[PDB]
Amino acid sequence: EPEWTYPRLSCPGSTFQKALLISPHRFGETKGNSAPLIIREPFIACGPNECKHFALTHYAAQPGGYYNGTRGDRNKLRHLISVKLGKIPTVENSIFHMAAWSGSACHDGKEWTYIGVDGPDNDALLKVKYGEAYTDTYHSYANKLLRTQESACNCIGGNCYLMITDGSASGVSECRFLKIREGRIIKEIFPTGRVKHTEECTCGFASNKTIECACRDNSYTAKRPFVKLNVETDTAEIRLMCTDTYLDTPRPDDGSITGPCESNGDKGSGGIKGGFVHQRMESKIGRWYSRTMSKTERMGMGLYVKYDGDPWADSDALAFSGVMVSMKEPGWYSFGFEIKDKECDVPCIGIEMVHDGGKETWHSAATAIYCLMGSGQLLWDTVTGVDMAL
Amino acid sequence: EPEWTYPRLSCPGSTFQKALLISPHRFGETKGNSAPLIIREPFIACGPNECKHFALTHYAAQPGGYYNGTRGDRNKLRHLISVKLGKIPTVENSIFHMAAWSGSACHDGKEWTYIGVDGPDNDALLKVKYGEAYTDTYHSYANKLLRTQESACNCIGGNCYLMITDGSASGVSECRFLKIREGRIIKEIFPTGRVKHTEECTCGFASNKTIECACRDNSYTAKRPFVKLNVETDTAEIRLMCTDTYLDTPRPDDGSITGPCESNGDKGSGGIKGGFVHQRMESKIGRWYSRTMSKTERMGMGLYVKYDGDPWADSDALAFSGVMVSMKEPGWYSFGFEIKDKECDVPCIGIEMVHDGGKETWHSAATAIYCLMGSGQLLWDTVTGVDMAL
Amino acid sequence: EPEWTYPRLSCPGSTFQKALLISPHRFGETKGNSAPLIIREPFIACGPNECKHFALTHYAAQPGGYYNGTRGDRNKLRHLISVKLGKIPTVENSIFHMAAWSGSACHDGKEWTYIGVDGPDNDALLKVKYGEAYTDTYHSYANKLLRTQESACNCIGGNCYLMITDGSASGVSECRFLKIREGRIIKEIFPTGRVKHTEECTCGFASNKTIECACRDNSYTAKRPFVKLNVETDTAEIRLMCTDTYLDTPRPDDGSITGPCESNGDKGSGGIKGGFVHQRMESKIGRWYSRTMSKTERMGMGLYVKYDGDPWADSDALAFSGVMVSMKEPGWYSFGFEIKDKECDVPCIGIEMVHDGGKETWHSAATAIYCLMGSGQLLWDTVTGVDMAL
Amino acid sequence: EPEWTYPRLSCPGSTFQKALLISPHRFGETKGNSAPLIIREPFIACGPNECKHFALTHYAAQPGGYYNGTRGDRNKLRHLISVKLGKIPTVENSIFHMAAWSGSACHDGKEWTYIGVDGPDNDALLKVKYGEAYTDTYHSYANKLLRTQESACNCIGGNCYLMITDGSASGVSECRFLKIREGRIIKEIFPTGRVKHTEECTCGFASNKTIECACRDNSYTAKRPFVKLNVETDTAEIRLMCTDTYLDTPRPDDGSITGPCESNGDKGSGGIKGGFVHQRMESKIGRWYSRTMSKTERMGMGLYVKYDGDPWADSDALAFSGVMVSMKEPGWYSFGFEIKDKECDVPCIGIEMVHDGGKETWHSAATAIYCLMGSGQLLWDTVTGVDMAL
Ligand SMILES: *[C@@H]1O[C@H](CO)[C@@H](O[C@@H]2O[C@H](CO)[C@@H](O)[C@H](O)[C@H]2NC(C)=O)[C@H](O)[C@H]1NC(C)=O
Ligand SMILES: *[C@@H]1O[C@H](CO)[C@@H](O[C@@H]2O[C@H](CO)[C@@H](O)[C@H](O)[C@H]2NC(C)=O)[C@H](O)[C@H]1NC(C)=O
Ligand SMILES: *[C@@H]1O[C@H](CO)[C@@H](O[C@@H]2O[C@H](CO)[C@@H](O)[C@H](O)[C@H]2NC(C)=O)[C@H](O)[C@H]1NC(C)=O
Ligand SMILES: *[C@@H]1O[C@H](CO)[C@@H](O[C@@H]2O[C@H](CO)[C@@H](O)[C@H](O)[C@H]2NC(C)=O)[C@H](O)[C@H]1NC(C)=O
Ligand SMILES: *[C@@H]1O[C@H](CO)[C@@H](O)[C@H](O)[C@H]1NC(C)=O
Ligand SMILES: *[C@@H]1O[C@H](CO)[C@@H](O)[C@H](O)[C@H]1NC(C)=O
Ligand SMILES: *[C@H]1O[C@H](CO)[C@@H](O)[C@H](O)[C@H]1NC(C)=O
Ligand SMILES: *[C@H]1O[C@H](CO)[C@@H](O)[C@H](O)[C@H]1NC(C)=O
Ligand SMILES: [Ca+2]
Ligand SMILES: [Ca+2]
Ligand SMILES: [Ca+2]
Ligand SMILES: [Ca+2]
DSSP, X not given: OOOOOOOOOBOSOSOEEEEEEEOGGGGOOTTSOOOBEEEEEEEEEEOSSOEEEEEEEEEEESSSSOOTTTTSSOOSSOEEEEEEBTBOOBTTTOEEEEEOSEEEEEEOSSSEEEEEEESOGGGOEEEEEETTEEEEXXXXXXXXXXXXXXXXXXXXXXXXXXEXXXXXXXXXXXXXXXXXXXXXXXXXXXXXXXXXXXEEEEEEESSSXXXXXXEEOSXXXXXXXXXXXXXTTTEEEEEEXXXXXXXXXXXXXXXXXXXXXXXXXXXXXXXOOOXXXXXXXXXXXXXXXXXXXXXSSSEEEEEEEEESSOTTTOOOOOXXXXXXXXXXXXXXXXXXXXXXXXXXXXXXXXXXXXXXXXXXXXXXXXXXXXXXXXXXXXXXXXXXXXOTTO | OOOOOOOOOBOSXXXXXXXXXXXXXXXXXXXXXXXXXXXXXXXXXXXXXXXXXXXXXXXXXXXXXXXXXXXXXXXXXOEEEEEETTSOOBTTTOEEEEEOSEEEEEEOSSOEEEEEEESOGGXXXXXXXXXXXXXXXXXXXXXXXXXXXXXXXXXXXXXXXXXXXXXOTTSOBOOXXXXXXXXXXXXXXXXXESOSBOEEEEEEESSSSEEEEEEEOSSSOSSOEEEEEETTTTEEEEEEOOOSSOOSSSXXXXXOSOSSTTXXXXXXXXXXXXXXXXXXXXXXXXXXXXXXXXXXXXXXXXXXXXXXXXXXXXXXXXXXXXXXXXXXXXOOOEEEXXXXXXXXXXXXXXXXXXXXXXXXXXXXXXXXXXXXXXXXXXXXXXXXXXXXTO | OOOOOOOOXXXXXXXXXEEEEEOGGGGOOTTSOOOBEEEEEEEEEEOSSOEEEEEEEEEEESSSSOOTTTTSSOOSSOEEEEEEBTBOOBTTTOEXXXXXXXXXXXXXXXXXXXXXXXXXXXXXXXXXXXXXXEEEEEEOSSSSOOEEOSSOOEEETTEEEEEEEOBOTTSOBOOEEEEEETTXXXXXXXXXXXXXXXXXXXXXXXXSSEEEEEEXXXXXXXXXXXXXXXXXXXXXXEEEOOOSSOOSSSOOSTTOOOSSTTOOOSSOSSOOOOOEEEEEOSSOEEEEEEEOSSSSSSEEEEEEEEESSOTXXXXXXXXXXXXXXXXXXXXXXXXXXXXXXXXXXXXXXXXEEEEEOOTTSOEEEXXXXXXXXXXXXXXXXXXXOOOTTO | OOOOOOOOOBOSOSSEEEEEEEOGGGGOOTTSOOOXXXXXXXXXXXOSXXXXXXXXXXXXXXXXXXXXXXXXXXXXXXXXXXXXXXXXXXXXXXXXXXXXXXXXXXXXXXXXXXXXXXXXXXXXXXXXXXXXXXXXXXXOSSSSOOEEOSSOOEEETTEEEEEEEOBOTTSOBOOEXXXXXXXXXXXXXXXXXXXXXXXXXXXXXXXXXXXXXXXXXXXXXXXOEEEEEETTTTEEEEEEOOXXXXXXXXXXXXXXXXXXXXXXXXXXXXXXXXXEEEEEETTEEEEEEEEOSSSSSSEEEEEEEEESSOTTTOOSOOEEEEEEEEEEEEOOOEEEEEEEOSSSEEEEEEEEEEEEOOTTSOEEEEXXXXXXXXXXXXXXXXXXXXXXXX
């Protein structure tokens, strides 16, 4: 007491449903009296007792006078913040963890590990925090743009596993994994296989033995690089997802990429972080994923699922499981996370819904949550409700 | 450590008194600096250590720019929120539990169960949350409009009981009860008797054996359907309240519905959720109710009591027990709840006091609280103090 | 664990010093973004682990549109609120305990007892709350204006003692004391002696055997009625303070009231709640008191002290101990309270500094605190810093 | 349960890195809805479970109407406030500890000791608070201007050590040390050596036996007086730092003060509080310092380190260890502090970054934090991001 946490069997269920919308800019009107933080790249991570809603803030509020620059990704002001999930992340509700323009976090059963990358592009620095204490750092190994998941890391028996990558956004970016224990990096993991470009991995436990991630290739393909990480041997291998249902944005028509599973295909350049989460059952594994409704634009978000098989080798289309966000609403980064029920884990997907009015106004996001619950089919979609002119 | 909660004997007392007003829009002036949430359908539920003040928000604040739509009931933005009772439910104080346009919640002695219905009208979805975890769902069975109590559910020995209903607002709505244990629906209960139309049940423990509810018939009668639910056999029966003191709004004159207790009578169309709470004594049960002072309008709120007898068979008027809200002030939904003292339970009735300026402006509500305390007669009424023009 | 608290010997020291200013209207400008609550009658009460700053709010903020009425004492909106001492009592920081236009509170070692009087003037009602639960009430016994201390009640071995009074503001008001245990009134105490008019008692422990109070006579004298309450026999006696240093406002010149100690003297009509607190030493008792610098107006506040003797019988002038508030700053109600150090009690006096611009604007107060600390003499005075035009 | 705290070996690491910015005035726009407090002289102190971010407020917010006076140092409104480190210090987040225009604070492993000086210049008063209780005071001994550290005090085994000083800002200010146990001054320590002028000491543990301080001489020299305080014998000695790298501002060129280590040299008038913190290793001690990048202005802040030797006798330059704040940004007071990891201590330096637009506008500050973490070289600087016109 407290004990290390481990992945458990998932809670019973067979469909996702609309759970919760965090839409702080519903309160950002000039007529209003609130101060929602301007953010992007939200994610959620849960421990034994609570869930935290994290994001990267531009250290500015709406309404405010610092909108200029909020459409960019990196600067000296960007910070990793969080609130307890369900609270509106305002100036006062939020806590500022560390300076960061790329982030992650995960609870190991005893304490929170927070991860923030900042610094100049060519020599950025990953900083590790354990509770209140800054405990370790890790250096840029390709001197291009060291960065991390923008979603939860994953802990088992006190060992927290984290994806990082470094390299050109439009070229080679070979990722690695760090094994972090009580805030200190105790092992590096160098993946083999199809390693050309892997970033913004969304990772979870397929079992006590294996972590899988669905990631983004920003240069070469609209198929998602798919990591299989063995946590017993601390080794990782990556291959493209073979599914005809290409999960990236942009992407070509489903199934249109000819040749073997590793064929890159058309419209590979560009990308989006994608949602992915495991439903671990006694004798099968459900893999849930999300992608935009639009093939080319960050609009809408659909849910998909496949049980079992080998994602590296199966071209089978994923089963379309419902519209979480209609194509009329923005659908940007998405991520997986799991909530800890008393005796089982509940898989969820979160969706960043960015308010984009161009660089001439503020630029921020709402966060929508869908979770496995009950049976049947997914019933309702999510709108942000935000009018950017107000 | 902790243990399951059970209803106890009520604390001594023989009259209700004005306890507390939560009037958030006292701070919603355009000249002000506050952000009260636009809400309706408030209710309260307490556990061993705290009381939570719940409501359904339209995800908008006053002052703000999203007033349009706030007089409606169902949309994709409504959420179940809560604060600790005594705190002003603002943007920042509140926590958002889940997407919902109909709600309930209750503590079982160990944890909170949160209940929220959303989805499309003809295929709505009840969602169950236990602590942070989404644990179960229940589907529309009439495919008309699945909905729930808008007040506390009732747990005993870990089993929480909840009214749901489904059907046309102007036709048949046959309710059901769900037995829910640690977030999971473990039994469905199909009531017998007068089941024609039952919705918005206000329920509480008459004893360790019986839950009773005072509900709303929105189409056929101004008498309230009265549920008796046997918690040992998990069976329920419903009959109209026979009291001449009809508790719904609108309603005809007291005693004017002639014939046997089950006669429906006139002005049965329409209705209102009604307050109801038990005073449990050693060999005597007090039943306390509230109804608007106006027969046709949602204005005022009066308190009533009757001891013992059979509400199904007794035509005698309930005893008038004080003006909680004068006819000059709004009196909308009302509900019962119990606060846990060290060794006994304190029964209370809460009153939604809606600020209604029609659809061209904001639409929200204050909450007044009356509790059993001391002896004598109820001494003072409650006003919201809100000028909607400000 | 936890244990009942008892008064202990005071911490070492021989002078008071400026400790803390709570001045919420420093943040109430129309140019600002805060919401301090409009309040009056502040007081402080401490338990084993924290101090709470209480006050009676008009349920309105500055800036705001409900200034009209905030110069009055009683209405249906007035509420007892509190924050942890050191926090600014704004809309969001404060917690609303109960409806009340007269108040008190005290911790008994295990739990908080909150006291609120509301209702119509001729039949007001004292309500008792223990933790979150409403537990008891007490009725108007003179049907004129039931009211209470506007400062902390006093608990010993679980027994909490409270002054109340009832009667005309300009006539007879015979006070009583209630003995309250775990939120329920278990004994009434009817004082003997000079009982004509006693209100707004400021009470504390002279020892484990005796509570003393310095109170206000609003009709007959500028001497303060002085209560001696024996907590072992639950009996109380009241006599006027004999000191030439008349502690009320208005008052005549010091020492100018001729005749025996009970002589009423000139300028008896009108009054002000006064500060009073005990310094309990091994073999002597220090009584600390406060009164306005002005003889006739609520301006300034000076500190006074006398060790030992019989306040009923000693005409000796109190030793003037320093200016806490200069005569250029407002000085309204004042009160005593004690902070619990690890092994000893620290005596303090708090001062209500009202911002009074007349009934045509807002009307509220800052709170200044002085405490026994170290030796020597009192060094610095307190200003509110507030410009009422902003 | 809990036990007294002691300094431990420092966590491993060999460079500082940018950790966290607290820039409250990023939200202080007139177009905004926030209320950052106007503050100066921030510092940080951590205990076993949390770090507190302290400052001295002028009891005014931005935006607000009390800017006039905020560029001054001493008045009757200044207060020591704090938030949990990571929270934005606003009107509502902050807590007000006591009236003070000079401050300090530290945790002893069981409880917080708060230190605040106020009163008139020629008769100021140091006040000690332990938890909620005011426990002790210490009087002006030179009757010129009693003042204290503006940074954390240092506790070991329950004994907390604190620098105080008193004297003319432009003449002799002979400091003293107070030994404080559970809020009470149990010993005075009179330093020997070069005691001419010592103020604003930044102190920390070199070991279980020795506290060291880097201080400010405001009249005679740009070398920092360096205190060595033996905590076992309770004796202290002071000598100028001999390093060519003069740490004060203003200062002449490095190494340009000729003669023996004790030579005062030129441009000694004026000064600035300087950062200083220990890296304790098994057989090696790291001393980390900060000084402005400008020789004459409060602009920029650079980090420096030197291992071992005797700071009193060593003229060798400290090693430059990175630009924490470039010369383009304000660099005012700086201070050291330590965060408690599970088993080791993390040394940090904080930097006050003042927003100075002169006396015709508001005057306040951000706080930048750098901590020991990882290896390599310090990688990124800090900006406030504040446009004072907004
Ligand atoms: C992963 O391993 C953990 C630890 O072995 C498994 O958790 C245990 O499950 C058993 C049976 O359910 C319990 O009796 C233990 O108390 C659990 N250990 C704990 C809580 O620390 C977990 O089930 C495994 N995950 C799987 C099999 O998916
Ligand atoms: C309902 O049943 C519960 C459980 O049997 C009763 O609670 C017990 O009350 C007795 C004293 O009356 C206590 O000594 C027990 O410790 C209680 N048990 C629990 C589990 O709380 C409860 O009193 C019953 N309620 C009514 C109204 O009779
Ligand atoms: C009032 O009575 C209480 C209870 O008898 C006294 O508190 C005790 O003091 C002794 C000696 O200081 C301790 O050993 C006990 O533990 C205390 N009892 C507690 C803490 O419950 C208290 O000193 C008395 N007040 C006086 C004498 O002024
Ligand atoms: C200063 O002294 C304390 C107390 O002796 C040291 O703390 C102990 O450290 C050992 C291991 O190094 C632990 O096993 C003990 O439990 C610790 N005791 C306490 C009371 O904390 C501390 O290490 C010393 N600091 C330095 C820098 O040597
Ligand atoms: C508010 O929204 C509704 C959509 O149902 C629309 O019909 C109505 O015109 C809107 N009101 C205004 C003022 O635009
Ligand atoms: C601010 O206050 C000072 C008092 O020291 C006064 O001299 C000055 O004129 C004031 N400024 C304004 C703009 O009134
Ligand atoms: C910010 O926007 C302004 C307005 O066009 C532009 O002039 C300026 O160059 C921009 N600066 C940055 C850093 O984006
Ligand atoms: C409030 O003030 C207005 C303005 O003079 C006055 O007309 C009205 O009678 C007042 N009402 C109350 C209740 O004080
Ligand atoms: Ca791509
Ligand atoms: Ca009806
Ligand atoms: Ca008088
Ligand atoms: Ca100098």
